[PDB]
Inverse folding.
């Protein structure tokens, strides 16, 4: 049986770790909710 | 506990307490990804949260009421993933989203890799508004993981 626990407030934090790239991808979404790449 | 904020979704079905995902509590409605709970009921102390709406294609589910989150990525600015990893404290990560181009339109995407149990963590704009949830994405030719910015529809 599942249960929930509070993990924090939802706020924007100034001076957070800035990381991660911005890739433009050609994708497809199937009936099961699965994303896949189209090439 | 119905206080607004970010929550861990846990299970005692496996060895110890295992974190299967994360969710957002807003306006008395709990929002998470469908693959975290599979539509199952949730416990919050003595209280029970029953599912209200869900969709396997969108990979979203809401508890106690209809989907409340309606803010969207502006397609220009950086965003923050408030990542809640298993066994670790909540952490904000700022990134500029990429794009998923589909036959039905473009969707924002965040190129951050985190454990499976981080699914449902909220993505926020500079005002702290939840513009979507992390956890439904794809694995690119790099081997890395890129998640869509998944947002529901508020009626
Ligand atoms: C590598 C990595 N994945 C994440 C987040 N996503 C998952 O873990 C995940 N996604 C799905 C399917 C099921 C429903 C349709 N969407 C995809 N199953 C799982 C377990 C973080 N890091």
């Amino acid at each position: 049986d599942m249960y929930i626990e509070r993990a924090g407030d939802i706020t924007w934090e100034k001076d957070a770790e800035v990381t991660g790239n911005s890739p433009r991808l050609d994708v497809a979404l199937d009936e099961s909710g699965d994303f896949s790449l189209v090439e | 506990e119905t206080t607004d904020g970010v929550y861990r979704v846990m299970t005692r079905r496996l060895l110890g307490s295992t974190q299967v995902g994360v969710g957002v509590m807003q306006e008395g409605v709990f929002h998470t990804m469908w693959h975290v709970t599979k539509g199952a009921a949730l416990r919050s102390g003595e209280g029970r949260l029953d599912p209200y709406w869900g969709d396997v294609k969108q990979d979203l589910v809401s508890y106690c009421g209809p989907w409340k989150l309606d803010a969207a990525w502006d397609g220009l600015s950086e965003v923050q993933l408030l990542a809640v990893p298993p066994g670790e404290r909540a952490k904000n990560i700022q990134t500029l989203p990429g794009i998923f181009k589909t036959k039905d339109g473009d969707i924002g995407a965040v190129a951050l890799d985190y454990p499976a149990g981080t699914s449902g963590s909220p993505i926020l704009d500079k005002c702290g508004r939840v513009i979507g949830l992390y956890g439904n994405g794809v694995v690119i030719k790099n081997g890395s993981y890129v998640s869509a910015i998944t947002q529901g529809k508020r009626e």
